[PDB]
């Protein structure tokens, strides 16, 4: 909406107010939209035990496709956007401008895979707030969508060749960042809550949990046609917003379908000492801010 010239602007996607803001808005919208029949939230220290707080409420079944959330500048501030096609969210940017609001953004809730998001405009791009740190999420973003179709009957389908081919594009970009002599391996999640261990997403108002092992089992730079993932709806969630357990009602539809486009991934690097030359990667996520970051990286907000 205005292309500032002779202007150089530091960005640091890793310290962006917008991310936190979006996150509070999203969380807030789900709470309002999708209410559980029982919500267990523990409160601590005080006394000795940890007095767990319980909220029981009517839990109307509600499923509908989340509409895109545009995010805008609050009274007093301004939104700068970087116009580079490729962009690592850090340092100076010169092709930049001010804008009313950000683009529409699907407030999709999920782990491992980023569904229905923006594709990279050139090549596959990988992001971290510290690649050296084997504890920080690696955000992948694709230039090509990969369909993934899921059903309440308990599975997700994916074209093996498309995926197989997506993995090539990444392992490639990975050994570009960790040495070109390095072997890229993909393995299943290494443990933790089901929501982190499986590719967990919402759909029809129901929470899916899909065994993604089949997607992360290969070795690069060292069959069957359509990958079918076993899944499961659960009524007992670990919440993503705050640390709570929540029980929802069983489903009331026999036709719960979900055709989404994988547009990015949340990986995690094993790392660790081992003069051995190869890098292990596993499907990560769980921290929805990573998800908002995958979309808001090209943005910053500044005192007018």
């Amino acid at each position, epitope marked *: 909406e205005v292309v500032l010239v002779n202007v150089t602007e530091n960005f640091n996607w890793c310290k962006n107010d917008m991310v936190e803001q979006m996150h509070e808005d999203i969380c807030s919208l789900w709470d309002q939209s999708l209410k559980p*029949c*029982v919500k*267990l939230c523990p409160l601590c220290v005080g006394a000795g035990s940890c007095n767990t707080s*319980v909220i*029981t*409420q*009517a*839990c109307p079944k509600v499923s509908f496709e989340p509409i895109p959330i545009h995010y805008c500048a609050p009274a007093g501030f301004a939104i700068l956007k970087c116009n580079n096609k490729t962009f690592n969210g850090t340092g100076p940017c010169t092709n930049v401008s001010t804008v009313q609001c950000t683009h529409g953004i699907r407030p999709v809730v999920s782990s491992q895979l980023l569904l229905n998001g923006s594709l990279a405009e050139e090549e596959v791009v990988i992001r971290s707030c510290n690649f050296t740190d084997n504890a920080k999420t690696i955000i992948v973003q694709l230039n090509t969508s990969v369909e993934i179709n899921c059903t309440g009957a308990g599975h997700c389908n994916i074209a093996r060749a498309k995926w197989n081919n997506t993995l090539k594009q990444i392992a490639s970009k990975l050994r570009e960042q960790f040495g070109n002599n390095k072997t890229i391996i993909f393995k299943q999640s290494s443990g933790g809550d*089901p929501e982190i261990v499986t590719h967990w997403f919402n759909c029809g108002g129901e929470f899916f*949990y899909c065994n993604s092992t089949q997607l992360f089992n290969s070795t690069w730079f060292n069959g069957s046609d359509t990958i079918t993932l076993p899944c*499961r709806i*659960k*009524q*007992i*969630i670990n919440m993503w917003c705050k640390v709570c*357990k929540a*029980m929802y*009602a*069983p489903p009331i539809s026999g036709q719960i379908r979900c055709s989404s486009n994988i547009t990015g991934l949340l990986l995690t690097r094993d790392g660790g000492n081992s003069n051995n030359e190869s890098e292990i990667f596993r499907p990560g996520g769980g921290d929805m801010r990573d998800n908002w970051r995958s979309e808001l990286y090209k943005y910053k907000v500044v005192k007018i």
Partner: antibody, heavy 128, light 110 residues
Framework: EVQLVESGAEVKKPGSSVKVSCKASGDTFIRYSFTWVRQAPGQGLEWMGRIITILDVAHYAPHLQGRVTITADKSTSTVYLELRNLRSDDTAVYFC?????????????????????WGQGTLVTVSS | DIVMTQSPATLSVSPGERATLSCRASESVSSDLAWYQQKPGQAPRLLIYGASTRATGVPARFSGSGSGAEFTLTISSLQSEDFAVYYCQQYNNWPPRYTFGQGTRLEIKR
């Protein structure tokens, strides 16, 4: 196919409180929910409350609220009913009942409100 | 709350004949309806749930139907051990405040 075995009869003076138990055998405790139901002589059945064993969250009839507590010790598969400030009209047989609710430990929970399994009943008599 | 009225209070059926028990709510409860059976001195026995599902162990001459607020139980042919008291329970609302009927007493007619 769980077996529910309750505790012996209780004799209480009005104002006393009572705690009846219910040992649950042969299956997976945390996969069941337990509901206490009672019946005055010559009278019908009355839902008292219900515990979601795996969450330790119990819900109660609005007309007992405050003076009834239901609990469950997962480490011995036993369930408990506590009636406080007893009245003569609290004299009844208190039953212990439960239905299977799904692979709970794995997120699955029907939240069934029927009652397939019962105990033999416990007579609680409240009187001067 | 949801009041559950059963009729009639007493059913005098002749052995081997047809019994039909009516259970009526004071508002819709979809299919969250169950029928129990009680014999003097013992715990009840779940018969039907979901308005029309026979519990494991229940014979076929037992069958329940209806939904919303209009429910009914049928015993196609009466064995001697079928004469008892029958209760209907609703378990629809949330938070959960489930309610029973006052029962129908089914007795041998002679």
């Amino acid at each position: 196919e769980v077996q529910l075995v309750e505790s012996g009869a209780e004799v209480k003076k009005p104002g006393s409180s009572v705690k009846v138990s219910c040992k649950a055998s042969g299956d997976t405790f945390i996969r069941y929910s337990f509901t206490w139901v009672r019946q005055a002589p010559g009278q019908g059945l009355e839902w008292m409350g219900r515990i979601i064993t795996i969450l330790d969250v119990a819900h109660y009839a609005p007309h007992l609220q405050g003076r009834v507590t239901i609990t469950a010790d997962k480490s011995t598969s036993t369930v408990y009913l506590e009636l406080r400030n007893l009245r003569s009209d609290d004299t009844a047989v208190y039953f212990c009942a439960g239905v299977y609710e799904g692979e709970a430990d794995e997120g699955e929970y029907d939240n069934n409100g029927f009652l397939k399994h019962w105990g033999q009943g416990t007579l609680v008599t409240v009187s001067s | 709350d949801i009041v559950m009225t059963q009729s009639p209070a007493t059913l005098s059926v002749s052995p081997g004949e047809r019994a039909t028990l009516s259970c009526r709510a004071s508002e819709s409860v979809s299919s969250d309806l169950a029928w129990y059976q009680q014999k003097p001195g013992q715990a009840p026995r779940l018969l039907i749930y979901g308005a029309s599902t026979r519990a494991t162990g229940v014979p076929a001459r037992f069958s329940g139907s209806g939904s919303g607020a209009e429910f009914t139980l049928t015993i196609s042919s009466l064995q001697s051990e079928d004469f008892a008291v029958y209760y209907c329970q609703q378990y629809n609302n949330w938070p959960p405040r489930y309610t029973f009927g006052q029962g129908t007493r089914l007795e041998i007619k002679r």
